[PDB]
Amino acid sequence: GKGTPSFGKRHNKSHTLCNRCGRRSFHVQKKTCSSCGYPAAKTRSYNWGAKAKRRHTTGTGRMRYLKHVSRRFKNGFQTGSASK
Amino acid sequence: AAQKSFRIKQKMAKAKKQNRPLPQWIRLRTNNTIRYNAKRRNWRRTKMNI
């Protein structure tokens, strides 16, 4: 049977977790993630996946550092002691 | 499985600590829209694909 039986022989993964996006996309017979070529330096992105370019792009996360630069520019990238 | 990794175990631990209800004192706040926990998960219904 090509169905209800042959869904029974499904117990070994062709995918596991990428260390750069954290989802089950790391093909392991070949070692490349399918949503961001991990060994590759560039993140996988194509301009036909314009939805995918919202689920991963800037603004999605914390923006630990980049959230503060408009605050720092406004003040002129000043430094030193706050004030009296 | 039994002979597992640590990444997996760590994620399972997270999913455990997530598998609790909503604390009732949340519901008494002054502007609250949260009635229950909708990100709830149990091994019968939904498998976490890790």
């Binding site: - | 175990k9 760590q10 399972m12 631990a13 997270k14 455990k16 600590k17």
Partner: protein, 71 residues
Amino acid sequence: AMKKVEDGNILVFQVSMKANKYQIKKAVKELYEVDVLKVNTLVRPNGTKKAYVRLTADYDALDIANRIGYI
């Protein structure tokens, strides 16, 4: 755990996941001024670590845990 204390000569701690049975040994040798002889660690499924230390005879774990404040 409070059974393994008073039955054995054991203390049971929660320790930092980065520790390695040697740091633990020296930490108990330092903070509580005892002399362990055997550590057995494991990871709990809340992602924490648990440490069963066994204290040498001539150190009683009840006398220690009363000194701490959890009996």
